[PDB]
RNA sequence: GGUAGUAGCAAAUAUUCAAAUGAGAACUUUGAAGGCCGAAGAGGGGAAAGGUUCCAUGUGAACGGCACUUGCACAUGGGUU
RNA sequence: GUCUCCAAGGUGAACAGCCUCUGGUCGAUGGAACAAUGUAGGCAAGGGAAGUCGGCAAAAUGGAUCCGUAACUUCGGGAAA
RNA sequence: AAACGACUCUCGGCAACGGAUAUCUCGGCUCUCGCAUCGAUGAAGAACGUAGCGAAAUGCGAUACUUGGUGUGAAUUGCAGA
């Protein structure tokens, strides 16, 4: 099917004692996981926002928790090997700030 | 398709370095299209090829 | 260097000349035994020694 | 050519065979070991499983110093097993021959299994190593042939 | 020490010539099976008796054995529970056996009658300094 | 340091090709070659090596000259004269 | 041959995201981000030494101690006023 | 290992160390884990050389301003005592 | 229950690796014989060029894998053209 969800992942736990030169490109793993096991899909792909976001603060000051946007897409092409698709991007982060903030349902 | 002689090519034209040349992403057929500097002179006139501040 | 000697220059030229595969034809002449040019040379691998 | 093992049945038999390819005997042999006496079948989706990742060729023979996983149990109780990628995918590119071979011979694909295949060592080629004390060393390749054969069960 | 120094130097005499089974070695360290004697209990704890909460006879602070916040790694103790002196074998939430002694008993030490006067509820998870959430609480202002 | 950094230092020609033979043997400063002993008039050649005599001996060249003089011994070097006519 | 698919691949801070091409992309090209050289440089030229390694196009095999669509490799052309 | 020319901003005495601009570059085969033993780099309560052939290694001191500076001396120094 | 399999070893068929063996030979080695002919009228050697398509070998010298005379008498040849 062909969902769109927002979710707050939660790095620094994920990325807790993690190699300096590492530690984003180990978030990056790390969200490409998740979007993994949340919408079923093997291939996922990151937006260059999002990769922005995580790489704003350099190497090693990840932010502790990513506020993303992950939109399962019926893949067009045919000689793709996976019928479906995860797109994640950013997330608006309400004034309230994330406190709060659970999963939510975007699609209309 | 690969643009290296078309970023030395826009480098040396403009008078910059070659980290400072931006080829458009979406102009790569067109722009490789190009292979003497009088064509990389006419892209950088038409915009396909600036120098980075 | 940039700076070399007309004679120099010449015994370049012909190693230059030389160093070519042969033409393609001479493997078909009868009672050929030539496979390729045996006397190739790479700037890098074996040096002139002039 | 003459195979180093022919079909019992010819007519109803395919072959496939590679000279000099550019992979390692051993890990081919181990390939090979495991896939003998295999429906074609079962045979292609082993060695899928192989290249995910998610089934292991057992290293039996040449195994010094081999490490040990949990996918290979059922194979080899030692545990003995690697994923040699290669070698599976030179192997299933044979085997995708000699099942177009049997569709131009006119057999049905759901009965074969492969009913021989082998590996040998082909030429070795050379080349070296700079050791300590300006010293030169071999640095040598060890490509193999393959043959396979498929038969029609029964 | 070239080449490291956290080892035995010498393991062994020219003669005989093997490696006995009585040299240091380095291999697997921890759990190995063990056996324990003489650990004495200093409380029975029943669930919904009265003698399960840590309350004593000098401290009356109403409080339960649970520490503040829970168990570090085990969680909240609600059914019947052992206080033993000492250490016992094992990590948290590993399972033990209790054995009946298989000696006489009859030393000071073990025939001794021991009078619980205070048992510590603080957190363990840092330098607790409160015995319960309400004493906190009444400490920050919050109630 | 007399080893492999002495060999970095390696860019002043001892020899250039000699005029004469044309080995790399022409010594520079003494200005005559090690090969042929050039510029002396006479070829630099020794007895005690027969492999080196053989290397360079009559007969290993072109013989532009040479190789006609047998041709014309054995028409007692005629000269100025051609076949009957046709 | 055994050794053995073993010893090893670890200095010079570091890569990531999207797209293009391609049978095949961690390694080719474009863009974006995050870093380094920090002007007695990992920048820009010369002397010696090398001799075509320079530039364009294309690429079976070998080589580039993994890989390559790639290249100081290979093949065909051009270039030093 | 191999001669030489050009040489920005900040801090700072300073072509010291550190950061940055132009220019260059992410080229050192990659992925997973974080056992022993190693290599490189730290910390460690109380004691303070008891270690060791031997204070080996490490630690301690360190810039600038002010006060002050002994024996000895070839009268110059010692002295940053 | 030490059976089936894996490993090691061993024997046999086949297939690999490698180039021994056998049969060859426009080459070598040895003996014997005939002749006497390099160069300032520029030798030997050394360099560079030269073919429609050649790098090497062989040949040749800007008349450059050959010019001319004579003999023989229908080719050269890998391809193309004359
Ligand atoms: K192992
Ligand atoms: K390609
Ligand atoms: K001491
Ligand atoms: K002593
Ligand atoms: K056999
Ligand atoms: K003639
Ligand atoms: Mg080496
Ligand atoms: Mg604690
Ligand atoms: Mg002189
Ligand atoms: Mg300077
Ligand atoms: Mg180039
Ligand atoms: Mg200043
Ligand atoms: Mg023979
Ligand atoms: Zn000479």
Redesign the pocket.
Known sequence: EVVTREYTINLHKRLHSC?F?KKA?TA??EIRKFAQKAMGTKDV????KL??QI??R??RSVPRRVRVRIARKRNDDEDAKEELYSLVTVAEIPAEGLKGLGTKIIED | ?????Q?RLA?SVLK??????????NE?NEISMA?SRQNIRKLVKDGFIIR?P | ????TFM?K??????????????Y??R???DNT?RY?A?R????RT??G? | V?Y??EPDNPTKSCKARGSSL?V????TRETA?ALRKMPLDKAKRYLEDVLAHKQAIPF???????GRTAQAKNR??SGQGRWPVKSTKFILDLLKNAESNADVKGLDVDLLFISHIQV??????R?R??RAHGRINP?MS?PC?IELTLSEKE | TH?????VACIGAWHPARVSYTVAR?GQNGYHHRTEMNKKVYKLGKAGQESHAAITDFDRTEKDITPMGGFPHYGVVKDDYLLIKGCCVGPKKRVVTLRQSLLNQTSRVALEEIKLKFIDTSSKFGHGRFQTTQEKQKFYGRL | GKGT?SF??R???THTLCV???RRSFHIQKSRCSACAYPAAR?RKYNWSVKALRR?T??????????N??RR?KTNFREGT?????
Not at chain 4, 24 to 27: A, G
Not at chain 6, 58 to 67: A, D, E, F, K, V
Request: aromatic residues 8%; contains cysteine.
């Open positions: 190699t030169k490109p990056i793993k792909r990151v937006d260059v990769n922005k790489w704003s350099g190497i | 398709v690969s643009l290296k002689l970023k480098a910059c370095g070659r980290g400072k040349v931006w080829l458009d992403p790569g292979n980075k | 260097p940039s700076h070399k120099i010449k015994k370049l030229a012909k190693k230059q000349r030389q160093n070519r595969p042969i033409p034809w001479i078909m002449r009868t030539i040019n006397k040379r790479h700037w890098r040096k002139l002039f | 003459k180093s093992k550019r390692h005997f051993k890990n070991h039996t023979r040449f195994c010094r110093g081999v080899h109780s040998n060592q082909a030429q070795k080629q080349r190593t700079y640095y060890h042939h | 080449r490291g120094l956290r080892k380095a | 950094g970095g230092k860019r002043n020609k004469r033979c044309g070829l360079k009559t007969g290993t060249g072109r013989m532009r000259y040479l190789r003089v047998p011994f051609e076949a009957t006519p046709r």
